[PDB]
Write a protein that binds this ligand. Structure first.
Ligand code: 3PE
Ligand code: Y01
Ligand code: Y01
Ligand code: R16
Length: 145
């Protein structure tokens, strides 16, 4: 029970400036119209991962392609909305953000390499990049405790 040896610090992410940007976005990030509106985008994104099936009409496969993009942008827009509102160094210190950073930087590059302008050759395969967009399911584990 004597963990008073640690756990001294608290939040300490206050910008405390009423600043032009930093205390304009930080107010947006906190005070849920964002905490529940990103807990709803990781709720529909765990439904477009279950909606893949075998022999889809090729316009079902296309609706999922443009939905996956429409969640990657939202999750990437989240990513550059917390480097701004918290600062770069205070962002990469929760370990639940450098997880959400990796999944988005790994799913941004899944959209590109499976698109044109770059070829899938040189004996290296983009099949393992599907794990990065199927790892957004673990973002639901965060609201366990
Ligand atoms: C939970 C952990 C899951 C780990 C990944 C399991 C992958 C299972 C599998 O069958 O992957 C196959 C695939 C490569 O083979 P594929 O492209 O599917 O077919 C080639 C046919 N000659 O596999 C790949 O392309 C990559 C497999 C994962 C690589 C990273 C592992 C860490
Ligand atoms: C968290 C959950 C409760 C929300 C929604 C998830 C499931 C209820 C949905 C998502 C994807 C669906 C699947 C998507 C595709 C198919 C193929 C489909 O096969 C056909 O094309 C034949 C008949 C048909 O068109 O449904 C049969 C239903 C099934 C398995 C669906 C069953 C219901 C699933 C699992
Ligand atoms: C974004 C989240 C909430 C996913 C839930 C959306 C689904 C309710 C939508 C998205 C893609 C839709 C599908 C896209 C393509 C088709 C093929 C379509 O078959 C056709 O050939 C008709 C017209 C066409 O798409 O060319 C019939 C409807 C269906 C199954 C749609 C049914 C409704 C779906 C599953
Ligand atoms: C034949 C296509 C059926 C698609 C069913 C999608 C259900 C989505 C629930 C949310």
């Amino acid at each position: 029970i004597d963990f008073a040896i640690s756990a001294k610090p608290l939040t300490r992410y206050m910008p405390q400036n009423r600043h032009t940007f930093q205390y304009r976005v930080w107010h947006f990030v906190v005070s849920p119209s964002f905490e529940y509106t990103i807990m709803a985008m990781i709720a529909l994104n765990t439904v477009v991962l279950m909606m893949k099936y075998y022999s889809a009409p090729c316009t079902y496969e296309l609706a999922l392609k443009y939905l996956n993009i429409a969640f990657t942008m939202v999750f990437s827009l989240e990513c550059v909305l917390k480097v701004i509102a918290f600062g770069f160094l205070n962002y990469f210190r929760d370990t639940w953000n450098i997880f959400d950073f990796i999944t988005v930087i790994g799913s941004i590059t899944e959209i590109i390499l499976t698109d044109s302008k770059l070829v899938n050759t040189s004996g290296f395969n983009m099949s393992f990049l599907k794990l990065f967009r199927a790892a957004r399911l673990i973002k639901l584990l965060r609201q366990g405790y």
